[PDB]
Structures are given as structure tokens and as C-alpha cells.
Structure 1
Amino acid sequence: DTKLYCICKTPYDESKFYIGCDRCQNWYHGRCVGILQSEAELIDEYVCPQCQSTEDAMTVLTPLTEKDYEGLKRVLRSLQAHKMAWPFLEPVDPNDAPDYYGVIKEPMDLATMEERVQRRYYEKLTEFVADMTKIFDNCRYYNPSDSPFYQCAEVLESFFVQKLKGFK
């Protein structure tokens, strides 16, 4: 066996403890991935750090499932019911915001997103996140940093990020 195992890329050492990753099927020194031999006994399926990292990054790129869509609706609704969401519920009315459409080239609001969710417009979570981010970026671009509108965007985006944790 001339294969270089683990993240450290070294030949197999029969005297050292290794744990196998069920995702990539490579073998890792327990110490290099933070797993103790006694600890391995209590582990069922094992996924190494690099594979876990890839899976985490993958979440926003994979196809949205019907279960994912039920989740998107849940997230949207929690945002719509949030106290700081009132400025983003519907498209901005020109009469309420001077030259808004002359400043904002790509408007977005929660009602438009709800419609997109309804017609399954999003194919990846990254697209949903992009529209939501657009709402907050548009607000912070149009409104001054000391206006409550700007602050509502800061609050809601922080709330949104937490809401998305462990989504898929």
C-alpha cells in the first residue's frame, strides 16, 4: 500500500489509530480529525471534517425539495410577522419614497418573494437568499445609516441569518 492517507497525506502506520469516512472512504488518524479511539466506539456513521465542510457549503447549491419549500414558506412567514418587517412587506410606493425607482435598479419585497415561493420559482437556496439579501441591501442603499428603515434592515437580516441555520 503506497497510498497517502489522512489530511496529513502519509503512508499507513499500523501502530496508529484510524477512523474511516463513509463519505469519501479515505482513512484518517484519529488525532488529525479530533476523534479519540474510545470515542469512535459511540459513533455510527462517520463523516470527516473536509466532507462535512463540503456538505455544509453544498446546502445552498443543491436542488430545493418539497420539504425545503415548506421550510421556505415557514421562514418567509416568520419574517413577514416580525416587528421590523413592516417596511418590506410590499413593493415600495413611489409616493412614499422620492425617486426610489431612480435609485434602486432591482427592487424586491416579501410579497414578491411569497409569490415566487408559491410558483416554485427558486431552484436553489442561494437564489432565495439572494432575493432576501437584495431587500436589505436596497434598503441600506436608499436610506441613510441613521434612519430607522436602515436599522430595520440590519435587525431583520440578523434575524434571517439565524432563521436559516440548519435549514437543510
Structure 2
Amino acid sequence: LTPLTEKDYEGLKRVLRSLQAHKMAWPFLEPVDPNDAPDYYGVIKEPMDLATMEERVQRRYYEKLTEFVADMTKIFDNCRYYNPSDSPFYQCAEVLESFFVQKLKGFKASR
């Protein structure tokens, strides 16, 4: 639609910080450690995590909201692809994605 403004970036920071404070965000705060899953980086071609997104927000990496949403969606898509549906990581991804949608709707409403 329209490119992100400085005021949009304040809203992105608020959304990201809300995700980072969520109780079920613990699997996604930092990159997957190869010890957590030895074949992870051979299976997942574009890893993503919230610390990486935080660095990108601080550097003003994102020009459009769709790019920020795409990175967030990678976090959850990676998790559901690698893990079976009974895994605690998978369950966390389901909870946090629905929370992100709720926060995303609020962000778009405030624009």
C-alpha cells in the first residue's frame, strides 16, 4: 500500500517488544542453536528469530509492512515445518502467531 514512516516504526517497535515479552515467545527470542536440533540449518533454508527482526527494525531495514510481516511469518512457518504438531515449539508457534495477528490488526488500525 504505502511505505513505512518514522511513526510506523514506533508501532513496529511496540509490536516487536510485545512479542518478546510473551510467555510463549521463549523458543523464538534468539536463533535456533545447532545443539537444539543438529539438522536444523540443513532443513530450514531461511532461519528467522525475534532478535534478528529487532536488529532489522533498529537499522530501519523494512520499507514496507509486508516485509516485516513476511519475516515474522517465517519464524512460525519454519517452526511448523521442522517440528511435528505435538512438539512444544509447534504449540508455542500457534499461540504466538495468533497473538501477532491480534497485535498486527491493532497496528494497522492505528496507521
Question: Larger Cα Rg: Structure 1 or Structure 2?
Answer: 1
User: Hey, what's the Cα distance between the residues in 2 that align with 1:107 and 1:116?
Assistant: 14
Give per-residue Cα distances to partners, 1:95-137, cap 9 Å, x unaligned. Answer: 1112000110000000000000000000000000000000000
User: Hey, what's the Cα distance between the residues in 1 that align with 2:23 and 2:94?
Assistant: 13
How many residues matched?
108
Structure of higher RCO (CA pairs closer than 8 Å, 6+ residues apart) = 2
User: Hey, what's the Cα distance between the residues in 1 that align with 2:27 and 2:82?
Assistant: 13
Structure 2: state its 5+ residue gaps.
none
TM-score normalised by the chain length of structure 2: 0.95
Identity of aligned residues (%): 100
Give per-residue Cα distances to partners, 1:1-23, cap 9 Å, x unaligned. Answer: xxxxxxxxxxxxxxxxxxxxxxx
Give per-residue Cα distances to partners, 1:42-98, cap 9 Å, x unaligned. Answer: xxxxxxxxxxxxxxxxxxx31101110000000000000000000000011001112
In the TM superposition, residue 148 of structure 1 has moved relative to its aligned partner by: 1.1
Aligned CA RMSD, in angstroms, stands at 0.8
Partner of 1:16: none
Deviant stretches of 4+, over 4 Å: none
- Structure with the largest fraction of helix: 2
Partner of 2:19: 79
3-state SS of paired residue (2:61): coil
